[PDB]
Enzyme design. Structure first.
Site, PDB file in Angstrom:
ATOM      1  N   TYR A  77      14.821  45.704 115.617  1.00 59.16           N
ATOM      2  CA  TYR A  77      13.478  45.994 115.160  1.00 59.16           C
ATOM      3  C   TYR A  77      12.919  47.369 115.407  1.00 59.16           C
ATOM      4  O   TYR A  77      11.709  47.570 115.367  1.00 59.16           O
ATOM      5  CB  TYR A  77      12.508  44.936 115.676  1.00 59.16           C
ATOM      6  CG  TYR A  77      12.824  43.562 115.112  1.00 59.16           C
ATOM      7  CD1 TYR A  77      13.600  42.650 115.831  1.00 59.16           C
ATOM      8  CD2 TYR A  77      12.357  43.179 113.856  1.00 59.16           C
ATOM      9  CE1 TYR A  77      13.889  41.408 115.326  1.00 59.16           C
ATOM     10  CE2 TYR A  77      12.646  41.929 113.339  1.00 59.16           C
ATOM     11  CZ  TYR A  77      13.407  41.048 114.080  1.00 59.16           C
ATOM     12  OH  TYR A  77      13.643  39.786 113.580  1.00 59.16           O
ATOM     13  N   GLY A 112      15.014  50.354 114.333  1.00 57.67           N
ATOM     14  CA  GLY A 112      15.679  51.274 113.424  1.00 57.67           C
ATOM     15  C   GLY A 112      15.151  50.992 112.030  1.00 57.67           C
ATOM     16  O   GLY A 112      14.616  51.891 111.369  1.00 57.67           O
ATOM     17  N   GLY A 116      14.079  47.199 111.092  1.00 54.57           N
ATOM     18  CA  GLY A 116      13.205  46.035 111.140  1.00 54.57           C
ATOM     19  C   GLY A 116      13.697  44.985 110.159  1.00 54.57           C
ATOM     20  O   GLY A 116      13.532  45.157 108.939  1.00 54.57           O
ATOM     21  N   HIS A 139       5.149  46.302 117.278  1.00 52.62           N
ATOM     22  CA  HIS A 139       4.633  47.482 116.607  1.00 52.62           C
ATOM     23  C   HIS A 139       4.596  47.189 115.116  1.00 52.62           C
ATOM     24  O   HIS A 139       3.577  47.371 114.473  1.00 52.62           O
ATOM     25  CB  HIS A 139       5.561  48.638 116.873  1.00 52.62           C
ATOM     26  CG  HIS A 139       5.054  49.923 116.359  1.00 52.62           C
ATOM     27  ND1 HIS A 139       5.814  50.745 115.546  1.00 52.62           N
ATOM     28  CD2 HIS A 139       3.897  50.579 116.584  1.00 52.62           C
ATOM     29  CE1 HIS A 139       5.143  51.850 115.311  1.00 52.62           C
ATOM     30  NE2 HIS A 139       3.975  51.779 115.929  1.00 52.62           N
ATOM     31  N   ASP A 140       5.709  46.727 114.561  1.00 58.29           N
ATOM     32  CA  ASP A 140       5.733  46.405 113.149  1.00 58.29           C
ATOM     33  C   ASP A 140       4.612  45.422 112.840  1.00 58.29           C
ATOM     34  O   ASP A 140       3.698  45.730 112.091  1.00 58.29           O
ATOM     35  CB  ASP A 140       7.078  45.790 112.779  1.00 58.29           C
ATOM     36  CG  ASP A 140       8.135  46.829 112.518  1.00 58.29           C
ATOM     37  OD1 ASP A 140       8.312  47.734 113.363  1.00 58.29           O
ATOM     38  OD2 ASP A 140       8.792  46.744 111.459  1.00 58.29           O
ATOM     39  N   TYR A 197       1.417  46.925 112.548  1.00 61.56           N
ATOM     40  CA  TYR A 197       1.098  47.730 111.361  1.00 61.56           C
ATOM     41  C   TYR A 197       0.691  46.840 110.198  1.00 61.56           C
ATOM     42  O   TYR A 197      -0.176  47.206 109.391  1.00 61.56           O
ATOM     43  CB  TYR A 197       2.290  48.590 110.926  1.00 61.56           C
ATOM     44  CG  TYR A 197       2.381  49.906 111.664  1.00 61.56           C
ATOM     45  CD1 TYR A 197       3.187  50.069 112.775  1.00 61.56           C
ATOM     46  CD2 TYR A 197       1.607  50.971 111.289  1.00 61.56           C
ATOM     47  CE1 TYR A 197       3.194  51.265 113.475  1.00 61.56           C
ATOM     48  CE2 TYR A 197       1.609  52.185 111.987  1.00 61.56           C
ATOM     49  CZ  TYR A 197       2.401  52.325 113.083  1.00 61.56           C
ATOM     50  OH  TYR A 197       2.377  53.513 113.787  1.00 61.56           O
ATOM     51  N   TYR A 250      -5.467  59.399 113.123  1.00 62.59           N
ATOM     52  CA  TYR A 250      -6.582  58.947 113.946  1.00 62.59           C
ATOM     53  C   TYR A 250      -6.974  59.951 115.020  1.00 62.59           C
ATOM     54  O   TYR A 250      -6.423  61.047 115.093  1.00 62.59           O
ATOM     55  CB  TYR A 250      -6.235  57.604 114.595  1.00 62.59           C
ATOM     56  CG  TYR A 250      -4.817  57.525 115.095  1.00 62.59           C
ATOM     57  CD1 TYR A 250      -4.383  58.327 116.150  1.00 62.59           C
ATOM     58  CD2 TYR A 250      -3.886  56.689 114.480  1.00 62.59           C
ATOM     59  CE1 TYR A 250      -3.059  58.298 116.580  1.00 62.59           C
ATOM     60  CE2 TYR A 250      -2.561  56.654 114.903  1.00 62.59           C
ATOM     61  CZ  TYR A 250      -2.157  57.465 115.951  1.00 62.59           C
ATOM     62  OH  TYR A 250      -0.857  57.436 116.374  1.00 62.59           O
ATOM     63  N   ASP A 255      -0.167  52.172 118.186  1.00 62.53           N
ATOM     64  CA  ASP A 255       0.690  53.229 118.654  1.00 62.53           C
ATOM     65  C   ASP A 255       0.523  53.485 120.146  1.00 62.53           C
ATOM     66  O   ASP A 255       1.493  53.828 120.814  1.00 62.53           O
ATOM     67  CB  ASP A 255       0.428  54.496 117.834  1.00 62.53           C
ATOM     68  CG  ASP A 255       0.911  54.373 116.384  1.00 62.53           C
ATOM     69  OD1 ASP A 255       0.684  55.316 115.602  1.00 62.53           O
ATOM     70  OD2 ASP A 255       1.523  53.342 116.023  1.00 62.53           O
TER      71      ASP A 255
END
Length: 121
Positions: free
Chosen positions: A28, A30, A32, A48-49, A52, A73, A99
């Site tokens: 997950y 490189g 995902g 993280h994925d 998003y 941001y 992040d």
């Protein structure tokens, strides 16, 4: 944006090259899309994925260039940790943390070469 989350990981891990160490690691991080994390560090890319996606749907993110890959941001990195600083945009504020969270997860979280370039799940 991508570039920013990159520097984040750096702020919390002085010495490392993100695009180099955290790229193509486990499943997950490189690309995902294999199933079943393989590390307490990898465990948090999937976070993280998923993070998003949560953000790419969020009601508060509308405009042009609001996607989490292109969203610049507000945040900072001061001698030690990095703390977000965007209030007005409850969108850009939400992203940072996706992040900031992983950027800080990776820190503690162990890295174990043994997995870098796998093959399949």
């Amino acid at each position: 944006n991508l570039l920013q989350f990159r520097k984040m990981i750096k702020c919390t891990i002085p010495g490392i090259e993100p695009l180099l160490a955290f790229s193509n690691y486990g499943c997950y991080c490189g690309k995902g899309g294999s199933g079943t994390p393989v590390d307490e560090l990898d465990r948090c890319c999937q976070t993280h994925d998923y993070c998003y996606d949560k953000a790419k749907i969020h009601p508060e993110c509308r405009g042009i260039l609001s996607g989490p890959s292109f969203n610049t941001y507000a945040y900072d990195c001061t001698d030690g940790k990095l703390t977000c600083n965007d209030q007005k945009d409850k969108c850009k504020l939400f992203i940072c943390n996706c992040d900031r969270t992983a950027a800080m997860c990776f820190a503690k979280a162990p890295y174990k070469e043994e997995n870098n370039r796998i093959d399949a799940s």
